[PDB]
Amino acid sequence: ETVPVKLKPGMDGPKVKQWPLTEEKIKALVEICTEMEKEGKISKIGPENPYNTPVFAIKKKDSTKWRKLVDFRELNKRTQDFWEVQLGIPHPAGLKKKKSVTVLDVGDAYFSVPLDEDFRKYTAFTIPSINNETPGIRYQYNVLPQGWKGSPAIFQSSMTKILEPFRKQNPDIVICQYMDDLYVGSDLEIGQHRTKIEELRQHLLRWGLTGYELHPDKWTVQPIVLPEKDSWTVNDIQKLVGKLNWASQIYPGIKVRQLCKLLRGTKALTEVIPLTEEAELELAENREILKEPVHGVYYDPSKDLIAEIQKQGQGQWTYQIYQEPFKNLKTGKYARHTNDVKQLTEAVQKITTESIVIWGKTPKFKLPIQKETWETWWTEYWQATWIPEWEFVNTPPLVKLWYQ
Amino acid sequence: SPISPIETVPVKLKPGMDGPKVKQWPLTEEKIKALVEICTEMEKEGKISKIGPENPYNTPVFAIKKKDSTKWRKLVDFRELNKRTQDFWEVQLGIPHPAGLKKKKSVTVLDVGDAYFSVPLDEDFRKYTAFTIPSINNETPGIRYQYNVLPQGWKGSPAIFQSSMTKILEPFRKQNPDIVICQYMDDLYVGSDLEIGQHRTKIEELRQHLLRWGLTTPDKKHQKEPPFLWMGYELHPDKWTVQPIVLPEKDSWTVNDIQKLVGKLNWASQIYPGIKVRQLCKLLRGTKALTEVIPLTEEAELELAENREILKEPVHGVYYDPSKDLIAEIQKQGQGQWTYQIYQEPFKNLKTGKYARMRGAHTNDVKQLTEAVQKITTESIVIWGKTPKFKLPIQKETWETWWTEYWQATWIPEWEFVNTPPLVKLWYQLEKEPIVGAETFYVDGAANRETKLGKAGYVTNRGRQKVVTLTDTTNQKTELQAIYLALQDSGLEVNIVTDSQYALGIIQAQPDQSESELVNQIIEQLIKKEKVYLAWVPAHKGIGGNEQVDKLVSAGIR
Numbered sequence: 001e002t003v004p005v006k007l008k009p010g011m012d013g014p015k016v017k018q019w020p021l022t023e024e025k026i027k028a029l030v031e032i033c034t035e036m037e038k039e040g041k042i043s044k045i046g047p048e049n050p051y052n053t054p055v056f057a058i059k060k061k062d063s064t065k066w067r068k069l070v071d072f073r074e075l076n077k078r079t080q081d082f083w084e085v086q087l088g089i090p091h092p093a094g095l096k097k098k099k100s101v102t103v104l105d106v107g108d109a110y111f112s113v114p115l116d117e118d119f120r121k122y123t124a125f126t127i128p129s130i131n132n133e134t135p136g137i138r139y140q141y142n143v144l145p146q147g148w149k150g151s152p153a154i155f156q157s158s159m160t161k162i163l164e165p166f167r168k169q170n171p172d173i174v175i176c177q178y179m180d181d182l183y184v185g186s187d188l189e190i191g192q193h194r195t196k197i198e199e200l201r202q203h204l205l206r207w208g209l210t211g212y213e214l215h216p217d218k219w220t221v222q223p224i225v226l227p228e229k230d231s232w233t234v235n236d237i238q239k240l241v242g243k244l245n246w247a248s249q250i251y252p253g254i255k256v257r258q259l260c261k262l263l264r265g266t267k268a269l270t271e272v273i274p275l276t277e278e279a280e281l282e283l284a285e286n287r288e289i290l291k292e293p294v295h296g297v298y299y300d301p302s303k304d305l306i307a308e309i310q311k312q313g314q315g316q317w318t319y320q321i322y323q324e325p326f327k328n329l330k331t332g333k334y335a336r337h338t339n340d341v342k343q344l345t346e347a348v349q350k351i352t353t354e355s356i357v358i359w360g361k362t363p364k365f366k367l368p369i370q371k372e373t374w375e376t377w378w379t380e381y382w383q384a385t386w387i388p389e390w391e392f393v394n395t396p397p398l399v400k401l402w403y404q
Numbered sequence: 405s406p407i408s409p410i411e412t413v414p415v416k417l418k419p420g421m422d423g424p425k426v427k428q429w430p431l432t433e434e435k436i437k438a439l440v441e442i443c444t445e446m447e448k449e450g451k452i453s454k455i456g457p458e459n460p461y462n463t464p465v466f467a468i469k470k471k472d473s474t475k476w477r478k479l480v481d482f483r484e485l486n487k488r489t490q491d492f493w494e495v496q497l498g499i500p501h502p503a504g505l506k507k508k509k510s511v512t513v514l515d516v517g518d519a520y521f522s523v524p525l526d527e528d529f530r531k532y533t534a535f536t537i538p539s540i541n542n543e544t545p546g547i548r549y550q551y552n553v554l555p556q557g558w559k560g561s562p563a564i565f566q567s568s569m570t571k572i573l574e575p576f577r578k579q580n581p582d583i584v585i586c587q588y589m590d591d592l593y594v595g596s597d598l599e600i601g602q603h604r605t606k607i608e609e610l611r612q613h614l615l616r617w618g619l620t621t622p623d624k625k626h627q628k629e630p631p632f633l634w635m636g637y638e639l640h641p642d643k644w645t646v647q648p649i650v651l652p653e654k655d656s657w658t659v660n661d662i663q664k665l666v667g668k669l670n671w672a673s674q675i676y677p678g679i680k681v682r683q684l685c686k687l688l689r690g691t692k693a694l695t696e697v698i699p700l701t702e703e704a705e706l707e708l709a710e711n712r713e714i715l716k717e718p719v720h721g722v723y724y725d726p727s728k729d730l731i732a733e734i735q736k737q738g739q740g741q742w743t744y745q746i747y748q749e750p751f752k753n754l755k756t757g758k759y760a761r762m763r764g765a766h767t768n769d770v771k772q773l774t775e776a777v778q779k780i781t782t783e784s785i786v787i788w789g790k791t792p793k794f795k796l797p798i799q800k801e802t803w804e805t806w807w808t809e810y811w812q813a814t815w816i817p818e819w820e821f822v823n824t825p826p827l828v829k830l831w832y833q834l835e836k837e838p839i840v841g842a843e844t845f846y847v848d849g850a851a852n853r854e855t856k857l858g859k860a861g862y863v864t865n866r867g868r869q870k871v872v873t874l875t876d877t878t879n880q881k882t883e884l885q886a887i888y889l890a891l892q893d894s895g896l897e898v899n900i901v902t903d904s905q906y907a908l909g910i911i912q913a914q915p916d917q918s919e920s921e922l923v924n925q926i927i928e929q930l931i932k933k934e935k936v937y938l939a940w941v942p943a944h945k946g947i948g949g950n951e952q953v954d955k956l957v958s959a960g961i962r
């Protein structure tokens with residue numbers, strides 16, 4: 001029997017456009033959907049279904065096979081009561097603590113469970129033709145679709161059974177599921193961890209379900225960094241108070257009053273000014289201050305998570321996850337044949353998975369790129385089964401270096 | 405006419421909504437007559453059916469006579485059933501571009517006849533299509549009917565008809581893979597590389613197959629001849645082009661003539677390389693009347709003429725060879741004016757086009773060039789399913805310098821430089837670190853929000869000094885002034901220190917064009933300098949001569 005799904009009140013189906021796709025991604029999708037049709041997972045549909053969700057094709061994580069990825073972001077927002085304030089999956093505080101965390105695809109589980117007859121239509125997607133020569137091929141799901149956050153919420157009960165054994169016998173292994181994936185944490189030796197993950201896929205395999213190694217406890221600081229130099233210049237100090245003055249009001253108890261005094265009247269920038277010691281007691285008081293966390297910054301389960309990324313150069317990208325600006329829950333960097341978009345794409349996924357590991361939810365990305373460029377390109381480098389929320393922006397000159 | 409043996413589409417009314425009950429206005433006898441004739445026929449044909457007064461739905465009818473002729477026309481105003489009908493999937497979301505068409509041996513156009521009427525309407529919806537032919541006045545209860553087929557002008561007819569025709573063709577397309585069938589509105593476009601033998605025959609198997617389905621197309625002889633005059637285009641067997649652009653010689657130009665013009669011109673751009681519309685468009689700004697006469701600016705006249713030239717002969721485009729590749733060439737026309745041409749074989753263009761857009765308030769040619777590359781890339785995906793290899797008037801080393809040091813991410817697909825001027829470059833770069841033995845200008849700007857009175861100035865480290873009074877400014881404008889000041893009086897190499905993240909940001913970007921004339925003079929300046937270092941500091945924090953320019957510009961302003 002099926003579970004009854006109902007769109008959040010006062011709203012209805014997604015009417016999201018289909019981005020145009022290339023010939024190769026189109027055949028890849030045509031083939032795939034024919035098989036899913038034979039296997040009866042998705043059935044063709046009529047004009048009478050106004051709904052629509054984009055669909056694309058990816059080549060997974062270092063794979064030669066084409067995977068079809070469905071952009072259910074709109075739909076997930078419209079059914080959010082169901083999968084969150086109803087059939088919610090509690091997130092394990094433990095997970096971020098493990099020396100090792102493996103991520104396993106569990107998305108094929110859904111293909112068993114049927115999708116409530118009344119909800120199906122919401123799942124429409126189109127396989128567009130080239131040069132609009134023909135009508136796109138329209139489909140609708142008959143089973144739990146992967147990418148829809150209703151699936152795990154529903155499937156939750158059947159995963160509990162699938163996992164009760166492994167759990168009874170491994171009380172210190174943390175098992176989390178965020179959408180299509182399973183996150184398995186353990187403090188075991190790596191060989192031991194790998195062995196249990198394998199022992200885990202055996203269990204999974206008896207129910208039909210057919211890793212990728214994270215090291216949470218090793219995710220550290222991106223402490224704002226002040227330079228150490230012999231011979232300063234008006235510039236560096238100017239730049240010094242600049243960065244310094246900015247880190248304050250975000251870093252509780254900074255100090256510059258000394259430094260400023262070295263910069264008095266109007267001298268050239270190229271001017272070397274030695275340092276007084278009290279001023280040095282300042283870099284240190286501050287420098288020391290920077291190594292240590294924020295204080296007063298706590299994740300608010302009810303608030304959205306934000307991630308901003310700054311292009312630093314030479315394959316380096318910096319980023320910060322926060323809920324209130326300058327109230328960073330987390331900062332870091334990502335470093336690299338890899339163009340800017342390829343790199344930015346990979347940053348976006350890395351951060352997103354950390355985000356999932358720690359808080360159990362994805363951040364809304366503020367990407368330093370053109371909506372267009374990004375829109376046309378990302379799917380070339382995309383390999384996750386989820387897609388986070390994104391918005392485009394222009395980095396504020398000062399932010400890039402204050403973060404360098 | 406046949407009324408399709410096929411399955412029907414479930415049609416529902418919008419939620420919490422009920423069918424229409426609009427009252428029939430009373431008609432003249434001539435029209436009540438007219439309608440009677442018309443209706444009995446539609447009923448004779450199966451097209452409509454007679455209901456009772458138990459069915460409560462109503463949609464107003466109207467008969468319209470003729471322009472020249474003496475024929476009557478039934479007009480049903482489905483505005484309410486439409487406002488109560490569900491929403492359907494979008495018909496076709498884009499229209500084939502000729503240049504995306506693969507050359508075919510023979511192409512035949514089959515226009516379905518009386519499409520909407522050739523297709524059933526969901527039985528349970530029919531009741532909503534209720535309409536009434538009023539009796540002579542109030543006396544006598546009207547005649548009630550209801551549609552059996554898709555009524556004209558109703559929300560779903562375009563959609564459903566489209567679907568039905570997809571379902572009808574499915575088969576044929578299976579046991580006929582090499583035949584191309586373009587579906588457009590109520591037309592069928594068919595082409596194959598068969599010898600006119602099996603082609604002229606395969607066309608008939610289709611027509612017959614269409615007939616098993618209620619669909620009547622025209623037979624040969626009544627089948628159109630090439631060049632097909634489709635959709636604004638001229639589709640010949642080995643080429644395609646736009647339909648005759650007739651640029652009107654006129655004495656006076658009205659807003660409306662200019663508009664119609666720019667239109668014709670823009671449509672011509674799909675294949676007439678190097679069409680410009682910037683000067684012409686410019687005239688449109690501020691818009692007076694539709695009938696108002698604009699005087700052709702000189703540039704405007706010069707554009708108009710460069711245009712007449714390009715059109716003074718005829719250009720045609722080729723079709724698509726999926727084996728050969730796609731090359732896209734872009735050239736800088738003028739002020740934020742780009743022109744591109746796509747071809748597979750050097751110089752035998754598939755299509756052309758232009759890009760002008762102002763993406764931002766200040767910008768440069770490298771930033772524009774990539775905007776055009778993006779616009780073309782997408783456009784290629786749409787038409788051909790793949791992106792072109794590009795040949796840009798930008799040097800590989802310029803691109804890379806820019807790409808590398810830019811705050812935002814950028815990525816151009818395969819490309820090659822091509823020495824076809826004007827060439828794309830950066831007209832100035834800011835130093836990475838302070839010039840030694842160059843003057844340090846500590847600039848500043850203030851503006852009282854009350855009086856909109858501003859003060860722009862500098863205080864250098866060679867004790868020099870200045871301050872200017874501005875009258876209707878903002879801080880942004882005073883801070884840009886201060887910098888222009890410092891540029892103006894400083895010579896070949898400076899060092900400028902501002903506290904304007906805004907001016908910083910603006911300039912760090914290497915703009916080369918701007919919507920602001922202030923930003924334009926500054927640009928002009930920076931382009932002259934041999935070395936310019938520009939740095940920032942917080943304001944209202946006793947820094948260098950920052951406070952020194954503060955008291956200067958604040959004195960009176962704040």
Ligand SMILES: N#Cc1cc(Cl)cc(Oc2cc(OCc3n[nH]c4nc(N)ccc34)ccc2Cl)c1
Nearest residue numbers: 500505507508593594595630632634639640641
């Ligand atoms: N009217 C009309 C019209 C509108 C469209 Cl979008 C398509 C169309 O057909 C084709 C047009 C094609 O173009 C290349 C071609 N081969 N032979 C031709 N003969 C013509 N008279 C016109 C174009 C072609 C190829 C296949 C096809 Cl089916 C006809």
